[PDB]
A paper describes a structure:
The main protease Mpro is a clinically validated target to treat infections by the coronavirus SARS-CoV-2. Mpro cleaves the two polyproteins pp1a and pp1ab, which are translated from viral RNA, at 11 conserved sites and is essential for viral replication and multiplication. The active site of SARS-CoV-2 Mpro features a catalytic dyad comprising Cys145 and His41, with Cys145 being covalently bound to the N-benzyl-α-ketoamide in 13b. We established structure–activity relationships for the 13b series by modifying residues at the P1′, P3, and P4 sites.
Third, the cocrystal structures demonstrated few interactions of the S4 site with the Boc-group that capped the amino group of the pyridone. We therefore expected that this part of the molecule was amenable to larger structural variations and prepared the two subseries 12a–12h and 16a–16e. A benzyl residue as in 12c led to an increase in potency (IC50 = 80 nM) that could be further enhanced by a two-carbon spacer as in 12d (IC50 = 40 nM). In summary, the modifications of residues addressing the P1′ and P4 pockets led to up to 9.5-fold increase of potency compared to the starting point 13b, as demonstrated by an IC50 of 40 nM for the α-ketoamide 12d with a small N-Me group for P1′ and a 3-phenylpropanoyl unit for P4. Also, the best Mpro inhibitor 12d was merely equipotent to 13b with an EC50 of 4.1 μM in Vero E6 cells. While the larger P4 residues as in 12d enhance inhibitory activity, they are not beneficial for intracellular exposure. With half-lives around 2 h, 6c, 12d, and 12g exhibited reduced stability in mouse plasma; however, liabilities were not observed in human plasma. With respect to plasma protein binding, the acyl-modified analogues 12b–d and 12g had the lowest values in the range of 50–70%.
Residue numbers in the entry:
A (entry chain AAA): 1 to 302
B (entry chain BBB): 1 to 301
Amino acid sequence: SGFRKMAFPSGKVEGCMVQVTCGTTTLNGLWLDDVVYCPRHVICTSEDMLNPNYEDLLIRKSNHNFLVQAGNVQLRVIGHSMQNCVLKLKVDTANPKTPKYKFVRIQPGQTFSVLACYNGSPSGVYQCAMRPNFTIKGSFLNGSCGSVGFNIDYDCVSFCYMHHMELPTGVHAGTDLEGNFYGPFVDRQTAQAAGTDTTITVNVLAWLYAAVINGDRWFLNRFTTTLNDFNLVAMKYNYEPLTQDHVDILGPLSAQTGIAVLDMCASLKELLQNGMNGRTILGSALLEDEFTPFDVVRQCSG
Amino acid sequence: SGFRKMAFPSGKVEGCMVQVTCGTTTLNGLWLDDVVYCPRHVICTSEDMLNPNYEDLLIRKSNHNFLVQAGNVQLRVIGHSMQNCVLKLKVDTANPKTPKYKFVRIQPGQTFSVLACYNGSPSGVYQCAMRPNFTIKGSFLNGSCGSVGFNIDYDCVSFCYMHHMELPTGVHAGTDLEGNFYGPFVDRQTAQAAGTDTTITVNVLAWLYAAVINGDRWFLNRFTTTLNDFNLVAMKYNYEPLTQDHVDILGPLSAQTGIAVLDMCASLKELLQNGMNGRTILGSALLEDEFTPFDVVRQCS
Ligand SMILES: *[C@](O)(C(=O)NC)[C@H](C[C@@H]1CCNC1=O)NC(=O)[C@H](CC1CC1)n1cccc(NC(=O)CCc2ccccc2)c1=O
Ligand SMILES: *[C@](O)(C(=O)NC)[C@H](C[C@@H]1CCNC1=O)NC(=O)[C@H](CC1CC1)n1cccc(NC(=O)CCc2ccccc2)c1=O
Ligand SMILES: [Cl-]
Ligand code: NA
């Protein structure tokens, strides 16, 4: 038993990480088949950052302006293509380490794993949620851009995130692997607002289920609640409202523990209104909202 | 910026993970060169588990009893050697994915990454600290035995831990790769005590430093304390006493932040003496002691 923030093993993705250099700027790219994917701002000087015209800036570049290094070997860039906020460099070699893979767009409240890289070398791996405001609380220094987030489904790597920038609050923003931002963000050096973050209620309920599986039972009451009653309490503590769909998702955990989703909602209800009375839950003094029901099932059952 | 529990990438160690079967028991092994290491209780049936004579139990086994599998491939076991609490199965083939590696015995206080496996398939990676009472707060289901813990220095993999068992309190216990148990534990199904854990003081300071680098400033104070003054309040709140070596190890974070180690020791005296009152440092309402000074550096420069 036990319970940690756990990430998918990084192997299949370590094999796709390369270094991309354009003049002064070097950052990380994703080499799959004969394409390398990286953020388009690789072309920007720090002058360009304030207010780039990526169209004009890319016309100034030719394939030979792009240095791609796979470990100790360079890959000749033959083509290049701007797709929204990513750059696709067509290269003369196909990644023989290319896994079975997918590009997906994750939803708020869903988690993925981040392979944090620098100069095309994997440095560290960790688990993130896409916040309801389409930001991530990651760990990125300069040189980490084009690091990716991913899930594995046995054989298949799902690529969902590429890291582009850090916002004034210290939270991070990136794109899907077709180069569209999550949220109202642009690849430019200007102060950008994220908006009010909210707690991922369905994930918090999942965490409380993980707590009971691991034998923290003190916060359980014999009470139940309706979805509407829970929700008008919840709104008040800035909690994402809970739909029938969120209940159907929590179902398998209901069943592993024999506690109905709505009895657990009554338990959450009481925690927001009473607040933990200096007790802990999975040795935490606050409620955790970055574990999906899938995360909890993956770990507390497989 | 930002600050996360980070694990080393698992690619190198994923290459070395195999499934080992003895009769009915199946678990994870580490395959380096032409040798697979695994926990020895692989030879046990669940009655044996209660009080095993590993010597007489191993005697009954021959190489053919030992099914080893690398994905779909069967490796021919051609020799077996019990070393403390690990089995060394010698096989006909060198792992061609064997990284540069060492076997190390980490100290209490130090972190490593865990690659959790089932049926010789990696499933997840997480970061642990070795507790002062030689337990780990792992995440381990049945099948995870033979899961290994490690650090990476550039290209070289330091193997430090192999998973054997869960204690009555929910924490986990294992061996180095010479199969000596971390702590006063044996591979018997019998209730065993870890006894009093303590807070790793040097880690709390490094984490306080991680906080300042990230702009959690609020707990900084005009004051500075002495080691002796600091340690008197440490003894009380069940913290490991602080030594010159600990100050010396915190030096580089001192350099990065411009905050003397004993200025920061005074923010901590403060916090233990007044609790946090439910205020948050890097959005934790409790003090974190599972980040080393090297882990904060590695991640904050
Ligand atoms: C990547 O491009 C990279 O890793 N290699 C170059 C970086 C990674 C960043 C920087 C540190 N942490 C990260 O996550 N990305 C950037 O530097 C972006 C590029 C922009 C999309 C075009 N970037 C550029 C300039 C400024 C910022 N952010 C900040 O300066 C902090 C927020 C802020 C606050 C006040 C006013 C403006 C901006 C940035 O992220
Ligand atoms: C491995 O043998 C394995 O993965 N094999 C398939 C497991 C790993 C376990 C599974 C659950 N969590 C883990 O860490 N290890 C064991 O099953 C050990 C083997 C014995 C050392 C030789 N093991 C066997 C029996 C019992 C336990 N522990 C418990 O039952 C919990 C603690 C407890 C409580 C009260 C009284 C006694 C023990 C065990 O870890
Ligand atoms: Cl906490
Ligand atoms: Na916490």
